[PDB]
Design a protein around this ligand. Structure first.
Ligand SMILES: [Cl-]
Ligand SMILES: [Cl-]
Ligand SMILES: [Cl-]
Ligand SMILES: [Cl-]
Ligand SMILES: [Cl-]
Ligand SMILES: [Cl-]
Ligand SMILES: [Cl-]
Ligand SMILES: [Cl-]
Ligand SMILES: [Cl-]
Ligand SMILES: [Cl-]
Ligand SMILES: [Cl-]
Ligand SMILES: [Cl-]
Lengths: 275, 275
């Protein structure tokens, strides 16, 4: 099954119903994907999920409380990580690669810290380490974005100011139209508030683990100017991690991999299959 | 023909005999490669030249005075660029991609400035823009390397200090053994002195053109700690260029692409064929 056709599946775990999809053929080391702020199953780019599922099983899921997943979204990354782990382990998956975008990129760092032996390789897109000052103003970034209707809100959050970047943003919106049937619910107000809290506190709280201690192979992707996360913080990830490859994409922003999805797939497929 | 079997060819141009090799099948947009400090035809990594010549014609050459090319190597990048252009145009090649490593990475920047319409895409490995302070001390870096016999000199210049990096350096030395037959001459003392002068002055002289004016697609590759060029100067290239992709490779140095040749080929092949 591809992105458009994979059915939404459900699994009950410790009193929570998790909604998920499995793309591609089943494989021994699946890639588990962790979504951005407010995103649901339908915010994944089909070019990326189709492209990466050619070579491995790919799992996309709604964490607790998000979209068609039941329950209450917790207010912190550590709890989101524990919740994700209960889900993944309920599926019987013991060893896997991870791809985290934005908030999801915080979760994969924390997961690698607490459960190193369950993760093989890590992809971080559009994120930052714990403690970064830029996230102290995340609520004000969202207050600015709140004023915008959907297309402008999407371009504001994810794209650069140029016609070149914005047109690739309109292309991404169209790709998100491709799922016609059995679509996810929107995130929910409760989930959005919990995530806003969690993202802000990832920046405000003193780091709780050393980035240098994550020994896994990592592939870090970012655009030239991610306003939310600060592009330089991806260079910081690369400096502090012992085995990270960095890719920076031109004239791009927080939604770098939406801007250049085929470049991302090409790079990521090599990383997972061969690095 | 592959790296090991391609014959050394010669072409007489304006009183100079240029030595070169052509790998792969002839193609409409060849990739012209520009070598590092003291390097000859035999310093190219066969994994890289074989890998990239699967999908395009690849030309490696000795610039004026270097190795089996005749004449006097000039003392500056601008002249090396003019010389390269007389060579490339003598072959009948009017439009081409370029790959420049180290000194060669300075030449491809200058070439894109003076002859933009002859270049399609640009790859820069292990280099820096004009004017960078780190190159003011290039002569002292070479004075330190001068004290070392061949294996240690090679690891000092090209690799990081770890066993992981140094072992990939020993692997590179073995790959450079693969060419058994019809090998190039060494650079020559005159060529080495001219290049040392040229590299130092690329840093000492005020910039003569704006990096921002190079509009071509560029792919910039560097390791985590290039002592010669400063890794941050590759981030500077990425910031200043309008259409550059950056890749930084972990626990690596000035010889980044020797450390991870298959990663480099994978990334570069996509860039040339698809970006
Ligand atoms: Cl986000
Ligand atoms: Cl709950
Ligand atoms: Cl573990
Ligand atoms: Cl910070
Ligand atoms: Cl720690
Ligand atoms: Cl793309
Ligand atoms: Cl060099
Ligand atoms: Cl001459
Ligand atoms: Cl021109
Ligand atoms: Cl400088
Ligand atoms: Cl200029
Ligand atoms: Cl490699």
């Amino acid at each position: 099954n591809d992105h458009a056709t994979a059915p939404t599946q459900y699994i009950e775990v410790n009193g929570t119903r998790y909604a998920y999809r499995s793309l591609g053929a089943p494989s021994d080391i699946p890639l588990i994907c962790f979504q951005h702020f407010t995103g649901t199953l339908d915010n994944w780019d089909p070019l990326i999920t189709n492209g990466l599922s050619k070579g491995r099983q790919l799992i996309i899921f709604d964490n607790k409380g998000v979209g068609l997943s039941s329950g209450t979204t917790p207010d912190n990354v550590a709890a989101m990580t524990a919740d994700a782990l209960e889900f993944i382990t309920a599926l019987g998956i013991r060893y896997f690669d991870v791809l985290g975008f934005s908030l999801g990129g915080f979760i994969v760092q924390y997961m690698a810290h607490i459960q190193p032996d369950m993760i093989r390789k890590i992809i971080i897109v559009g994120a930052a380490p714990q403690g970064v000052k830029v996230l102290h103003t995340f609520p004000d970034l969202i207050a600015r974005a709140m004023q915008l209707e959907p297309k402008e809100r999407f371009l504001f959050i994810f794209f650069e100011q140029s016609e070149h970047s914005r047109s690739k943003g309109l292309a991404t919106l169209g790709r998100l139209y491709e799922r016609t049937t059995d679509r996810d619910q929107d995130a929910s107000a409760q989930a959005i508030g919990a995530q806003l809290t969690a993202i802000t506190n990832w920046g405000k709280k003193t780091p709780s683990f050393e980035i240098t201690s994550i020994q896994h192979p990592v592939f870090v992707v970012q655009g030239s100017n991610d306003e939310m996360m600060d592009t330089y913080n991806s260079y910081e990830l690369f400096k502090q991690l012992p085995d990270a490859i960095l890719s920076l994409y031109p004239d791009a922003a927080h939604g770098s991999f939406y801007q250049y999805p085929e470049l991302f797939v090409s790079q990521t497929e090599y990383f997972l299959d061969s690095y």
